Amino acid sequence: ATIVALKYPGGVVMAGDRRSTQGNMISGRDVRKVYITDDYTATGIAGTAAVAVEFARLYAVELEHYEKLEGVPLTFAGKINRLAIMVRGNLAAAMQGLLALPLLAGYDIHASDPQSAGRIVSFDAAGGWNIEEEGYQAVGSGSLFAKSSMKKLYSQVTDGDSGLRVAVEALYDAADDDSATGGPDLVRGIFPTAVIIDADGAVDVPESRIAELARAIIESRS
Amino acid sequence: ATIVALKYPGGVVMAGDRRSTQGNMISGRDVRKVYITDDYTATGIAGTAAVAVEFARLYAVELEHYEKLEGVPLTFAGKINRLAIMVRGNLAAAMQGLLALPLLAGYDIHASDPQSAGRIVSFDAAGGWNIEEEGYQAVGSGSLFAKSSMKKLYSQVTDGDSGLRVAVEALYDAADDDSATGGPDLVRGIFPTAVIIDADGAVDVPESRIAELARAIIESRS
Amino acid sequence: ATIVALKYPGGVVMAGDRRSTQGNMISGRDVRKVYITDDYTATGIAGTAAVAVEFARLYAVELEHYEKLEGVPLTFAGKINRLAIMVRGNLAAAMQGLLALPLLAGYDIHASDPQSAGRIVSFDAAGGWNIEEEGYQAVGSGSLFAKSSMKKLYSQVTDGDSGLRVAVEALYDAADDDSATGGPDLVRGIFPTAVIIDADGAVDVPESRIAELARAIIESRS
Amino acid sequence: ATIVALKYPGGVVMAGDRRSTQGNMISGRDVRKVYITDDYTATGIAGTAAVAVEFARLYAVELEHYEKLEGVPLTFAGKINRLAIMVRGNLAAAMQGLLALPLLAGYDIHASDPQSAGRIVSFDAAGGWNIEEEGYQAVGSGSLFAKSSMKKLYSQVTDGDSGLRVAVEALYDAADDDSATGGPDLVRGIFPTAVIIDADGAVDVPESRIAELARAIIESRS
Amino acid sequence: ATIVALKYPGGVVMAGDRRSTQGNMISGRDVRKVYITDDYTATGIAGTAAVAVEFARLYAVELEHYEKLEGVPLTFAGKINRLAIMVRGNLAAAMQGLLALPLLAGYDIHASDPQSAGRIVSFDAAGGWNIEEEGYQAVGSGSLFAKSSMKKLYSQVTDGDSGLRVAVEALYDAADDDSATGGPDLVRGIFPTAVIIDADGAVDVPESRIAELARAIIESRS
Amino acid sequence: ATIVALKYPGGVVMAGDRRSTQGNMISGRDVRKVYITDDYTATGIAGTAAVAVEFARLYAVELEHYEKLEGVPLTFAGKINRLAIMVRGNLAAAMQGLLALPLLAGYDIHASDPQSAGRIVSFDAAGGWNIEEEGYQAVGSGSLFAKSSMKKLYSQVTDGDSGLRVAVEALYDAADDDSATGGPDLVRGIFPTAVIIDADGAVDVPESRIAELARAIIESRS
Amino acid sequence: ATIVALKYPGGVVMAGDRRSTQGNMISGRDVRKVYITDDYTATGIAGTAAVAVEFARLYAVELEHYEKLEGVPLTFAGKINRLAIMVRGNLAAAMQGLLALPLLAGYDIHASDPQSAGRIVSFDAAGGWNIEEEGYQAVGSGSLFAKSSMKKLYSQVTDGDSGLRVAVEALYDAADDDSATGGPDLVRGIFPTAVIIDADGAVDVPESRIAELARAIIESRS
Amino acid sequence: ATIVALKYPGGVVMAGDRRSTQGNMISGRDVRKVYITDDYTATGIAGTAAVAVEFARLYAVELEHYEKLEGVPLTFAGKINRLAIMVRGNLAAAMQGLLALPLLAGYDIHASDPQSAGRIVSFDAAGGWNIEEEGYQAVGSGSLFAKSSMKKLYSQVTDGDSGLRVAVEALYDAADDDSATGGPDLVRGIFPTAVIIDADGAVDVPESRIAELARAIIESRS
Amino acid sequence: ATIVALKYPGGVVMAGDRRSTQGNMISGRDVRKVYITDDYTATGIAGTAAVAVEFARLYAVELEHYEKLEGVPLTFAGKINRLAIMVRGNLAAAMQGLLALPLLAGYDIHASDPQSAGRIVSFDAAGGWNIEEEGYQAVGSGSLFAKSSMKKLYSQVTDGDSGLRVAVEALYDAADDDSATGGPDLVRGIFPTAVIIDADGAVDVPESRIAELARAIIESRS
């Protein structure tokens, strides 16, 4: 399990792997771990799937409920506070073993500079949150390898396509260096899913672009 | 870690994977686990590498020492007894965690029927040994998947090439179903190693044949 | 504690940090961890210093004793076997907490190709050894960060100076990403020590070259 | 984590480091640990960030709520009592491992002598509080080194700039003597944050002054 | 218990406190912890007295025995090795609770520069040794406070008297900041003992000089 | 921590030390441990400060509340019962480690003989109370030494000044024999605080008298 | 169990109680705990009687054996070393519960000043020894009370009778303050035993003198 | 702690010691343990004082409350039932260590024979009660010795004075045979307290009679 | 199990009960526990019978062996030392549960006064021994009751018959007060065994005298 997210001028990208493992045996091959909560942010949870899907659904439901009740969407700080409270409320279950660490990436429509409106937030096991400002952040088992790869590869990010390519390459490096992370599948045609958030909203990247990027990266590495 | 061995008319084949993992992180990519002790048998040990290489070297040294002292090679039963004693003498270290389960495949030159002279022997953690007679046997973490694949694929074994193809396909299935087993590497050009033992002795299969077999299997599975 | 070693055409380089920490408090600022055993190989041990210096001295003494007794130096395989036996004999003390993982880099004078005569060997806690062939290897607390940095930076290695620069940059990255690794000191003038082994023997890199390389890297990163 | 605070004629200064470490790996590089609750006092919490930010926000909210309800600000003794109750109410979580030790520095507008109106209060893990009167106090992992440095350097404090320089030098010494404390960053341009409280209220020290002070201290130490 | 030692041009000084405490109750008031082994070095052990006196006597006896047997005194490296072996041989008793950490200070008569012939060696609990080169080192319960005081006060060391004054001031600071360290006694006339080693040998500082230095320091601090 | 109290004809005196220690390190140098609850009695608590200040404040608040509600002050037996109930209600926290043993000294205005109206009450950890009648009582870590000193020195008590001198001498002896008790400070000018209760009420002894008494005692002991 | 010993001009006295208690029940009423080893020293052991008598007999036997073998008595330092070795050799039994702490008092015939030839040595549980120089020392359960009493009463010691009276008074105070120490028995006529060592040798004090001293002390205390 | 009670024609006597011990150290010298609940019975509790005084006060309060509510005193069986319920309700605290075993002695005014109206009741730790009919009963640490002494001495009981003398002698024997029981004090003038209950009610024995009885017993034993 | 022994002018008597109990069930009714080792002393062991008989036989064998080897009987001190060594050598088995506490009574033929030549020695579980001088001593489960009875009844001992009667009465009292001690049996005719030692040697008391004494005591108690 590895989820990466980096900031590019005018938006933010988010991607994750598609592998679920029960110990050392592979259980899933195309598991989806990146979800869209509402128009201008997406979340990704690494850990137990049973807690991850529940957290995603509950976060989306709470955001929609508040928006319907008050008539206006929550501010970014309010969303961060709600997610932090949700994470903190599961500390006992995390101690038992039901651990889920989410990653939040969104676009701030109430920012003076649209080019620097992208935000990346990481959460701790105890509920603490920190706003990422180095331009990238990764979570999961292979987070360290992906973070090092992004540290070296962030100099080539200029637009959305460059950021997507860097994210795919970081995921490939994490899968190469970690046995719990699943790389691109050229036999079954399974590729990581990505979400791009910009001023127009959050959209889902088509599988064709990710397939071409993965094929190009594999050819280059050969 | 997965090592497979099956019997074909006129000989016996033996193959294993090339992956070493320290927990969940990949440490090796072309680790060799199949060794040739003397002319008419080869061994393969799955488990801790530090114990596996030591066991292989010690077994070869003991066989050579006996052959030099007495002037004649040991019988197959004597070799099985020596290997069983060696395995039994390491039970305390196996209990602590230094476990090594070897697999023995050899050719009996003192058999009435040369076509049925192949032998496969499996060893337990307590030193018990059993002569395999179903025609195939696998050891390691992904032994069950490989054994099922060989159970379905043993009907197509007629000669050495068919047995080698079946072994490679079983290793591929085990790597597909197990995250601790490494499949063929089309980027770095790493392929499993195989040893063929027949009436002329034990030889090492060239990497080119294994590469072509793996490529054909991958193309067929696509 | 971080020690790195990579292979370049015609030799091999080896370097390590200069930090000793007692828990979370800094105890040493210029600790030397890379030692020269004899003419054509050098070793580096990461872990408890009391065991590291003892292991280095004992290995050098054993090599010199064998060379004096037999009149010829040991082969590389013999040196690897001796070091593996020494590491394996300390497993109980390592279990208690006195752990020391050495890294071996040397030059093989009995190789057909002088340009590919460099060797890098890594040792496990149980005494297992593996010959490194990816071109680089790192040990210590910050080994992962240095290994990722070398994975990205190995494409620029052409000669000794390039390899030394890559090693220094990898050490700098490891110190940046790890609080237990000490980076270059521009106030006290403390810089990591490096050893270069080639066909002419093993020599110690002067501090001036490492100082200039570290200053250039710091200026580039600014 | 290290937070220092000392008293100068006519006010009080407060500063802290910008390092967050998850065990031995660095997680944050510009973490803010000094916060302003209201006009005439500021607080600093060392320990778990998830508890520290919550404590700061809750203390500020409680003070504002009381001021709005009663129409007058709380006395200094009342603020100390409220903070002590808040600290005491978290003793079980501190026993489990969620420990947070705050440091309180403020200006008493109801004092006969304005020059001696500065107050420094330290809190224990059990909720006990003591008013600091030696002129300085430090909390965190590297509190001892900073306290010794301030013990030697307090003789040069005459005004606000002298106190700020002494605080920065004490933080530098603590970072030098402790691996968990982050010193000034000349590459990324990260410097410790400081807050100055005087008769006109609590203000935030601009980063430029701290940068010049740190550069001067580094040059002097060279 | 606190023992300090610092280097001055042309020699080395060594001093320690005179307090023995059984838990929280004071048992001794003039305990001697600095001993002279032979002509050109002195040792000081902090910890259990029953082990400290035994270690001092055994070290002196071993040095004298070697000098009598071989006719020449041991080199400094040999003395360090012997002391390290002695410390390492007591690791089990230290684990039970009989811990003794010695501090070694000596003068090297076989050095090119007489002004830089002073040496300070510190030993770890596991037997590891490191040659001190910052110019000072302290051991005992209040070692940190004394080390910080010496860090600030080392700039005034020019000769033997300055070094002695700095050592006495550091001991006074350690006694002030630590309840297990005994300061100067103006009622019973008990003062710390000091040993000065120079090119002429190791001598014992008379109590009168230490008394005057302590009185001057107390008057200055008033 | 040591608090002493003895009876003299016409009143009662009470005094305590000014040292707070966190294990073996000194944390406070002028901590106040003797408090005045109301007109005709004072209390002193030895142990955890966080519990001691809370107990003193709560006892004073309860006494004032009862006096305001009923219009008449509580009898001495009622005050003893209230304090015993308060002590008994904290037995679980004392078992965990939050132990606080108070000492009560007061003047009974409803006694037939004004000269024998002084009362001293000691409390146990389980809430039991006993009225002291030997003429003196001490509590704290160094209670035994102070009690022995008062046993020898009680023959010289004739009036208030004699009792104060005896109490100061007992505190000095306790500080001499105990490392957790702080004696008079001739450098920082810190002296123990004392409270005198007589027929006119409870008053605080000025620091000048205690300073002169301590100086005279120190001169006599020299 | 309480044994006291103090120094007077021209000799040294030693005395102990006569009570043995099995838990809380009295088992003995006239147990002797002070023994004479040879001419110029006597010893007293507090703790388990079965170990105490054995230690006394063994010490006397060893001293006599050495004197007979070498023809000259051991020096005082040699006797101290032998007793320390004997105490150290029983550390395991002391840990189990068979603890015996001896007290050594003797006269040095090889001293320049006969008036200051008295010596008092105390031993720790780990075998450490310290020469007493305050003029008095007590061991046993009620050692603290006796030591405080001697601290106050040492000013009246001028000769042997004064020292004996002070020792008897200290024993009486220890018995008064400790329930495990037996005071003088006026019904059965049991009184503590004392030994006086001077330039003429060690002699046993007659019971009549101790009886008169105890009666006078009891009458004075009435 | 020892409390004795025996029956004589026409009444019943009750007495107890005056010693309180905290482990092995004496804490009290004239502690009162025999109390009068109402006109025709008295109680004595041995064990923790904090529980003993509380039990005595609560029993007296309950008896007075019932007498005031119903207008008639409780029967003896009702009093026994109430005391048994009170003892049974404290079983958990007794299990923790807060054990208190009371002894009840009273006079039955509703009995046919006034000469045999005395009653002695003993209570167990579980709340069980038994009416004593052998003529005597003792409780406390030294209960066995006192019971044996009363077994031998009960033949001389004819009236109140004889019973009082027998009780005092039994207490003296218990104090002689037990170190936790305090005998008569001829120095401080402390003697055991006794209560005599007859047809006229319960009265307190004056100290003079007990003093004369103790002096006569001591003289006889001499 | 109860064994008693008391001293009378001109000799010493020794007696014990005849009951063996396995927990709470009676196993033996006439078990003999008093044995004669040699002419002038007898021993009695209380505890495990399997150890008691072995100890008696071994002690007798050792005494006879020494007497035969040297030609003269051992002194009383030598016998005490041998018995103490034998008891001390069984401390581990006693800790497991095989406890045996012997009682020694003998006649000293080498004493100046024949009337005071009787000796009684008691031994502890750790091997310590004490010579009894109060005139009586008892061991076993009911030792306390017998000792109290002898304390009251020792005033009537004038000769052998009086001592025997006192011993029988003490045994009867111990059996009455203890359920593990067997009293005289008037149905089966079982009575305690006694041994009388005087100047003429040790003899066994006939059962008729003990029967008459027990019958007289029973009649008197009726």
Author numbering:
A (entry chain O), B (entry chain P), C (entry chain Q), D (entry chain b), E (entry chain R), F (entry chain a), ...: 1 to 222
Paper text:
The Mycobacterium tuberculosis (Mtb) proteasome system selectively degrades damaged or misfolded proteins and is crucial for the pathogen’s survival within the host. Mtb 20S core particle features homoheptameric rings in a conserved α7-β7-β7-α7 configuration. These rings assemble to form three interconnected compartments: two antechambers formed by α7-β7 and a central degradation chamber. Stacked β-rings enclose the degradation chamber where active sites containing the catalytic triad of βT1, βD17, and βK33 proteolyze substrates.
